[PDB]
From a paper:
Proper operation of the pivotal CME cargo adaptor AP2 requires membrane-localized Fer/Cip4 homology domain-only proteins (FCHO). The AP2 complex, composed of α, β2, μ2, and σ2 subunits, is pivotal to mammalian CCV formation, and its deletion is embryonically lethal in mice. FCHO1 and FCHO2 are similar in overall domain arrangement —folded N-terminal acidic phospholipid-binding homodimerization F-BAR domains and C-terminal folded μ-homology domains (μHD) separated by a ~300-residue, low-complexity intrinsically disordered protein linker, which has been suggested to participate in AP2 activation, although how it does so is undetermined.
To confirm the identity of the extra, Cμ2-proximal electron density as the N terminus of FCHO2 linker, chimeras of Cμ2 alone with N1+N2 attached to the C terminus via 30-residue unstructured synthetic glycine-, serine-, and alanine-rich flexible linkers were then created, crystallized, and their structures solved at resolutions varying from 2.0 to 2.6 Å by MR using an unliganded version of Cμ2 as a search model. Muniscin family conserved side chains make key interactions with Cμ2 residues 167 to 170, which form the BR3 PtdIns(4,5)P2-binding site. The N1 interaction occurs mainly via complementary charged interactions between Asp318, Glu320, and Glu321 and the Cμ2 BR3 PtdIns(4,5)P2-binding site containing Lys167, Tyr168, and Arg169. Mutation of key binding residues in Cμ2 (E320A+E321A+K326A) reduced binding fivefold, and mutating Tyr323 to serine rendered it unmeasurably weak. The FCHO linker does not directly interact with the Y or Ø cargo motif binding pockets in any structure but does pass close by before its main chain changes direction at FCHO2 Pro327. The weak density that follows on from N1 adopts a range of conformations forming crystal packing contacts, which we believe to be nonphysiological (mutations FCHO2 Y340S and E336A+F339S have little effect on N1-N2 binding). In support of this, mutating four of BR4’s basic residues to alanines (BR4-) caused substantial reduction in binding of GST·FCHO2 linker to Cμ2: The lower level of binding reduction of Serinc3 loop results from binding Cμ2 only at BR4 and not to BR3 (43), whereas in FCHO2, N1 can still bind to BR3 even when the BR4:N2 interaction is disrupted.
Numbering used by the authors: 152 to 219, 240 to 437, 477 to 489, 497 to 502
Write the structure that this text describes.
């Protein structure tokens, strides 16, 4: 009974790391079309899990998710994942490639945590004025902070001048872009902010009702709008004898805005050790 030799094409043998560790990045884009009254007309999240594996040997990994939450409509796995166990047990088990790879990508349309509601109100005062007020609510944990928030409010062509007021961030009228651009650096959850706009209009000869573009928003969020949460990443190397109890896990959720709209009334060193790449923690290089 001679035994076969196991050669995996995506991971060589003899990977040695001074410090066993791994990175998990849950990257997601949330998309939205919301009515002016707050009705979700469309919404979806595309996401993927990027793993950087700086582990030694041939480690056996089991990635655990908060799904028996996140409702997954369809997902494609990297070849390393054992498709048999995900069929029956819903387990994600693999010996990962060395370095960075995409463990899975997925799509979500249900139970989506929309990080921002935009409540718009545009009032008409004759053909020479247009009074705009826009509120944004952050509907996540107060513990968390959103970055790079930008709100785009469309202005009609015949805008002759705007005076804008806000108490958060900055708001500049960009006539070439036909928009008021409202940039906020940071904002916590369960909060509100508001912008005020008095827009002056030159009346035209049409009296054709202005067909509004939607109000769009850009932002980053430190969680997954799909609701996905990393429960565990168990590791076991049988030959070197180490488990995830001996490993450092670095986990990060980056939630991005995709099209988020709301209508407004319309490698090895000398000794055989692999070197990590480079780019404030007690254990980071």
């Amino acid at each position: 009974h001679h035994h076969h030799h196991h050669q995996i094409g995506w991971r060589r043998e003899g990977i040695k790391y001074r410090r066993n560790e791994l990175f998990l990045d849950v990257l997601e884009s949330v998309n939205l079309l919301m009515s002016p009254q707050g009705q979700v007309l469309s919404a979806h999240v595309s996401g993927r899990v990027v793993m950087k594996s700086y582990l030694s040997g041939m480690p056996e990994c089991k990635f655990g998710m908060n799904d028996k939450s996140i409702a997954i409509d369809d997902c494609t796995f990297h070849q390393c994942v054992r498709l048999s166990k995900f069929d029956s047990e819903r387990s994600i088990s693999f010996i990962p490639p060395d370095g960075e790879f995409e463990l899975m990508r997925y799509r979500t349309t249900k139970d989506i945590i929309l990080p921002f509601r935009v409540i718009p109100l545009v009032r008409e005062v004759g053909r020479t004025k247009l009074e705009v007020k826009v509120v944004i609510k952050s509907n996540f944990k107060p513990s968390l902070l959103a970055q790079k928030i930008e709100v785009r409010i469309p202005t009609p062509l015949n805008t002759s001048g705007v005076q804008v007021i806000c108490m958060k961030g900055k708001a500049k009228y960009k006539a070439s872009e036909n928009a008021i651009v409202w940039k906020i650096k940071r904002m916590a959850g369960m909060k509100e902010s508001q912008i005020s706009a008095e827009i002056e209009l030159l009346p035209t000869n049409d009296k054709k009702k202005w067909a509004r573009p939607p109000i769009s928003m850009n932002f980053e969020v430190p969680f997954a709008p799909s609701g996905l949460k990393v429960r565990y990443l168990k590791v076991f190397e049988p030959k070197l004898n180490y488990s995830d109890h001996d490993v450092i896990k670095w986990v990060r959720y980056i939630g991005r805005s995709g099209i988020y709209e709301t209508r407004c009334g319309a490698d090895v060193d000398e000794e055989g050790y692999s070197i990590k790449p480079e780019t404030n923690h007690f254990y980071s290089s």
